[PDB]
Every structure is written in C-alpha cells, then in structure tokens.
From Swiss-Prot:
Location of the protein in the cell: Nucleus
Protein name: Bromodomain adjacent to zinc finger domain protein 2B
Family assignment from sequence similarity: Belongs to the WAL family.
Cysteines joined through disulfide linkages: none
Subunit annotation: Component of the BRF-1 ISWI chromatin remodeling complex, at least composed of SMARCA1 and BAZ2B, which regulates the spacing of histone octamers on the DNA template to facilitate access to DNA. Within the BRF-1 ISWI chromatin remodeling complex interacts with SMARCA1; the interaction is direct. Component of the BRF-5 ISWI chromatin remodeling complex, at least composed of SMARCA5/SNF2H and BAZ2B, which regulates the spacing of histone octamers on the DNA template to facilitate access to DNA.
C-alpha cells in the first residue's frame, strides 16, 4: 500500500527472453499456420467469428516497437494465437494438431524461463 512495497522481481531481461522464446516458436517446423495473419478476404467466416486475430509476425512487430507493457501481455497474445486456432480448426486437422503442438512447446519454454 502507500509507502509499503513487496520486493522487486528483476524484469530487466524480460524483453530479451520473450524475443528468444518468440524466435524458437518462429523456427519450429509446425509454425507455418501462424507465421502471417490469416487472410480475411480469402478465408470465409474468419473475420466474423474470430474477434481478435493474432499471429507470430504481429507479435514480433509489437515486441520490437514497445507495445507490450510487461511479459504477461506478451504471453496473452501468444495464447490468443492458439485459442483462435482451436476455435476455427478441427483437432484432427493438420492446422489443429499444429496448434496443440505449439501451445505445448510454448508453455514449457514459458515455465522453464520464468517460473
């Protein structure tokens, strides 16, 4: 509360560490459905159904330009990518299975790096 502060968790490396995780996600062989925004003109239904589209390229631009206030807002965008994928793709499709694999990959890196 006023003038009473919990000890300072060192966040000085968070930017560099999120960037490393994002590089590893970008270079995974199952990253291909997630590298660019879904094309809203060519994919019927996507625009109306998926209220907040997200992809790896958009996260990388946000991260390079100071648009994440902290490491948690970065993790929320990564999870948004896989939540959108589960919303629109069958589990037993190539893109559905890719999304489950990538989510697993991300959450292990997240816990190993920060928890």
């Amino acid at each position: 509360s006023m003038s009473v502060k919990k000890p300072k968790r060192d966040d000085s490396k968070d930017l560099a560490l999120c960037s490393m995780i994002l590089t590893e996600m970008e270079t995974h062989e199952d990253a291909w459905p997630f590298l660019l925004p879904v094309n809203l003109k060519l994919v019927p239904g996507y625009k109306k159904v998926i209220k907040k589209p997200m992809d790896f390229s958009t996260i990388r631009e946000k991260l390079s330009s100071g648009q994440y206030p902290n490491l948690e807002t970065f993790a929320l965008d990564v999870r948004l990518v896989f939540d959108n994928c589960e919303t629109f793709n069958e589990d037993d499709s190539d893109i559905g299975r890719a999304g489950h694999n990538m989510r697993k990959y991300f959450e292990k890196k997240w816990t190993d790096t920060f928890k």
